[PDB]
Design a protein around this ligand. Structure first.
Ligand SMILES: Nc1nc2c(ncn2[C@@H]2O[C@H](COP(=O)(O)OP(=O)(O)NP(=O)(O)O)[C@@H](O)[C@H]2O)c(=O)[nH]1
Ligand SMILES: [Ca+2]
Ligand SMILES: [Mg+2]
Lengths: 171, 107
């Protein structure tokens, strides 16, 4: 039995993963979260209690309540948004509320590395999507155990992979 | 500040989900204790006071979504601090919305 909490900027992809992971369903339309609990099972069999949270400052006062007795925190970001790489706020929040718990860095929307319109918009700001090895470096620099990434839209398999590794780490 | 109506439940323990409770009108500037008290005045309307539970033995739980559940309290790790002073947590602090289910659970 493991309790995981997902945090990170609004629209970064946290609920999309949990829904794919636990509900067999990709939510293509953005509906902002307040707080929610999913239950998944990943083969020892491990029962995951997964706590989804708002990435909004508006809910800064309730989201920290989700950290209590957690096994790990999944600090999430959007790979197509090298501005969601705020992970500064996020890591300081996790440390202030939750200093005993380990931290995993999770990159989301990896499918967008080959999305032309994303690449065109990024390149007009002289930017590029976060790469895998950049994600490994950021993990190290934020003092996270490991970097993991997937795409909830194009690879359910990758999302299952993220959580099976998170499971192994909390146990 | 602003008025809210909560779906107030008595619950056996902290946990996931909601059920039909009683509408309870509160203010968003009410502390978690004041809202608990207001909820109990409704959940035990007509019942003599020596037959009601001591409110100090009950926690307030905000149930949100399908299975989200969090204990709210007048003071916790989220409370505002300035010097030696702390602000008591209100419904507005947590952003509990109108129509929210709030359960009273054994403490
Ligand atoms: N291309 C792509 N888009 C994705 C992916 N995952 C999510 N999205 C898009 O991003 C939107 C927002 O994701 P969501 O998971 O809802 O965001 P969130 O991080 O949970 N936000 P909040 O904290 O505000 O509740 C989704 O509705 C979907 O359209 C992905 O893997 N690839
Ligand atoms: Ca869908
Ligand atoms: Mg969400």
């Amino acid at each position: 039995r493991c309790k995981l909490v997902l945090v990170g900027d609004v629209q970064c992809g946290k609920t999309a993963m949990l829904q794919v992971l636990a509900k067999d369903c990709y939510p293509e339309t953005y509906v902002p979260t307040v707080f929610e609990n999913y239950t998944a099972c990943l083969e020892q069999r491990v029962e995951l209690s997964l706590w989804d949270t708002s990435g909004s400052p508006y809910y800064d006062n309730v989201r920290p309540l989700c950290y209590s007795d957690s096994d790990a925190v999944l600090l999430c970001f959007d790979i197509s948004r090298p501005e969601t790489v705020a992970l500064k706020k996020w890591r300081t929040e996790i440390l202030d509320y939750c200093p005993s718990t380990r931290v995993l860095l999770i990159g989301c929307k990896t499918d967008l590395r080959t999305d032309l319109s994303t690449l065109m918009e990024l390149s007009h700001q002289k930017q590029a999507p976060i790469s895998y090895e950049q994600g490994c470096a950021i993990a190290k620099q934020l003092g996270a155990e490991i970097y993991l990434e997937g795409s909830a839209f194009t690879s359910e398999k990758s999302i299952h992979s993220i959580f099976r590794t998170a499971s192994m780490l909390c146990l | 500040y602003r008025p809210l109506t909560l779906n107030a439940l008595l619950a056996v323990g902290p946990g996931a989900g909601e059920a039909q409770g009683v509408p309870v009108k509160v203010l968003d500037c009410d502390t978690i204790s004041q809202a608990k008290e207001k909820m109990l005045d409704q959940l035990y309307k007509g019942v003599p006071l020596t037959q009601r539970p001591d409110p100090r033995t009950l926690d307030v739980e905000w149930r949100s979504g399908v299975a989200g559940h969090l204990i709210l309290s007048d003071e916790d790790v989220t409370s505002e601090v300035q010097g030696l002073w702390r602000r008591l947590n209100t419904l507005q602090h947590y952003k509990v919305p109108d129509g929210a289910t709030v359960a009273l659970v054994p403490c």
